Design a binder for these strands. Structure first.
Lengths: 180, 176
DNA sequence: GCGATTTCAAGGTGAAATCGCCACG
DNA sequence: CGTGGCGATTTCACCTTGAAATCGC
């Protein structure tokens, strides 16, 4: 029952759950402690998105999940939010795959961000302060690509960028605005 | 005409000559040189929007200079104007009735139009990517400096997910 | 009351620190 | 001798677990 992720146990536990089963019962039908079945589902609930940032989910501990699945809903638990956060930490994150250490610290590292960054974006959510995430980082001094969401308003800002790009963007933005 | 003279005389400005001298190496009244030079100044990206440059007057160059100013003067905001009206320029350039001067006049009047509103929503240049009847629902494009941005507001999440996704690749594709 | 969840004490575990044993100048 | 090497051991800090206390209706 462990070769694979508390999560895959969870997959099962839900399949039954979904079928009308109380954990108290599943625990029975499977031979698991009511207390584990909590945990196995508790984990099988973790925000797929976040879970997907880590290299060795196998190194992902439940308590982590508990806070991973915690950050999940404490951040609206909606596509556009998870999407945004990733963007933010992703740079510093892959930056963590450059750097020695074992699966142990990398885990604690990646999550450090998922929490801090998410807890930095959550600030301007009630504070309703404009939040920007740099879409791409340039070695350059004056070049930038970034997004800024300050409420229900949001913009895509670019500087010193190709003409091939204003070209493309302009084209696709205008046609997507046709589509809807 | 006067422009050409300008650009030519220009070479001599940088030749390190004073107008007074150039107004002699060309037996041109010095007033004339001032005027040629001022003309030589108008935005090349606008002067070349006229099929018959021979027909732009001084005051025309003079007011192209103007439009050019009022709008910062950098290429990217020109292209911004130059595309917004380019259809109606190739358009008017299809009309057969009107005489050549009627052409420049119509084209010039076009060029002044853009300048006024694009710099009203600003310096910067802002074109309305789309018009929503709501006092606070917009989707636009903005240029100023060598920097452009697509500003939106009060739109569906779905819209934002797509653009986000799209733009996502459009960069990934090229920054690579 | 009654599931579900968290708490508690009792085991695991791995990474890092220490230890053993050795072989070499 | 005095050392450095390096595979095995132990430490230590964090896990997981079931049971039983606790929660939250």
């Amino acid at each position: 029952a462990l070769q694979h992720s508390i999560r895959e146990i969870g997959l099962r536990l839900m399949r039954m759950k979904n079928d009308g089963m109380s954990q108290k019962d599943i625990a029975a039908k499977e031979g698991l402690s009511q207390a584990k079945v909590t945990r196995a589902l508790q984990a099988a609930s973790a925000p797929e998105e976040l879970v997907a940032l880590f290299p060795v989910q196998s190194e992902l501990t439940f308590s982590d999940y508990k806070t991973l699945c915690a950050v999940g809903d404490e951040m609206g638990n909606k596509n556009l939010e998870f999407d945004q956060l990733i963007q933010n930490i992703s740079p510093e994150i892959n930056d963590i795959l450059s750097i020695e250490m074992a699966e142990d610290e990398v885990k604690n590292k990646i999550l450090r961000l998922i929490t801090k960054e998410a807890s930095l974006l959550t600030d301007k959510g009630s504070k309703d302060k404009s939040v920007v995430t740099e879409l791409w980082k340039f070695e350059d001094k004056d070049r930038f690509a970034r997004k800024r969401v300050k409420g229900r308003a949001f913009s895509y800002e670019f500087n010193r960028l190709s003409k091939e790009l204003q070209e493309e963007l302009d084209r696709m933005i205008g046609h997507i605005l046709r589509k809807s």
